[PDB]
Amino acid sequence: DEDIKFQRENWEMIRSHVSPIISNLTMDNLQESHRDLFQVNILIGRNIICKNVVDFTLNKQNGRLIPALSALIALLNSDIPDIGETLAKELMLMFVQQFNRKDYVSCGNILQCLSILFLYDVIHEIVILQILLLLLEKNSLRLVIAVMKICGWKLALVSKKTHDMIWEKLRYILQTQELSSTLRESLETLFEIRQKDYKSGSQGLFILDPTSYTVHTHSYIVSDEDEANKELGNFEKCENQIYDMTSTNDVEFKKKIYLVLKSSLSGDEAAHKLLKLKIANNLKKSVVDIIIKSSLQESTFSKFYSILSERMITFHRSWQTAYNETFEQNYTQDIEDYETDQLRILGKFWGHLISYEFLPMDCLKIIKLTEEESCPQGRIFIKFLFQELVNELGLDELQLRLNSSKLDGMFPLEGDAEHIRYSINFFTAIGLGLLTEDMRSRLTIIQ
Amino acid sequence: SASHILIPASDLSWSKQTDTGITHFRAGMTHEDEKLIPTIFRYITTWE
């Protein structure tokens, strides 16, 4: 009978949409999950949606997910109060079943769920204070104290005095009464929190505005006899701007930095001003470029910019990354512009950084010497780099650092004779060449 | 104006002994709004 077929296969599809939507609910997916859920026929499946949300909450695989499930139920209760009403009936009845069973786990689950539904104004604080009064007439205090941790902020706002009275009763037991040691300590801790104020207990998924929740605050009491329409969980047979071409904005900041730089005697007070500005991580790349561009105007290198960059490095690793990235940017992209003079500035300026290890040294690996790929201007750059880097180390420490720095592409031992001829011939063209002996051996080994 | 800068203030009692370095800066010269001004020693290359 193809209407009974259609309506059954539609009911089945609705159930198997709702189940995986509930199973894929999280904070930061909740609003896409709620869209999808709203595109299912929630009203026809009202009991199917209630039973999946309860059974997921209650599966105790969750419990952590109770705040998420409560936020989903809050959204849905603004849309369709009849659904949130149904879900709150069954959850009350599940709490009272688990209390009477003495199932402490399902007490803890369902009580935490009622707590967060009250946090989201789905249900009235009356139900919480009645649950807590019932609990506190027996011990059950592990239950009562978890509940009060998870509602107790909202209870203090809405109903200070009743809550206060309960605390007085709760307080009364601890000071003048005998209790099991494990139970008491948890009981005391809640007492500690009251002085603390619950400041690890007011954080979550408030993803409806206090007027966009159409605030159907359902006034249940946990001693009604209620309905819970399990039967709606059967199958049945329903016969029913401007583009920016100008950096002038960045030009302002450029003049502010350059002006900070031209003031400030010594170097060590200029680092103070620059670090004082607290530059956002985005810009701390370019500020370096301003520094060096300025250093190229000075017509001669100065220890100033060296000690400046050194005092700037050691403060924060973002400046490490800054100078490294700018080293690659300079050597790779930007060298082709500079005349042989400004190269005399750059060579020493990076020499002081490398020889004292601030750079660090292995970042020299970018350099590769080939007739095919090199810049003669860049060649001069290397010349000044090592000719500065020697004078501080003295060609002694140089060989040790290099030999321990595993520079490969620059110092080929693997083969390619002609390249080794270019390397050795090059360092002998610098006027040093004493780094090339190990390669000279490989010449005779190749021949 | 060569006097704005900032002046290293470090540790009167110790700087008689170690040369502690520059641990602090006393304000060199003042203003209503700060702005900044360049100072000569920056515009003349060092002897070295």
Binding site: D268, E269, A271, H272, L275, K276, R311, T314, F315 | I7, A9, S10, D11, L12, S13, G21, I22, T23, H24, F25, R26, A27, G28, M29, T30
Partner: peptide
């Protein structure tokens, strides 16, 4: 706090006697 840095007082020094820690050299 005045730790022994600064001036005995700022009167004849013409400055503001404003002292501030140096972010530059620490580690």
């Amino acid at each position: 706090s005045y730790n022994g840095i600064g001036l005995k007082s700022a009167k004849g020094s013409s400055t503001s006697g404003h002292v501030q820690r140096s972010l530059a050299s620490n580690n």
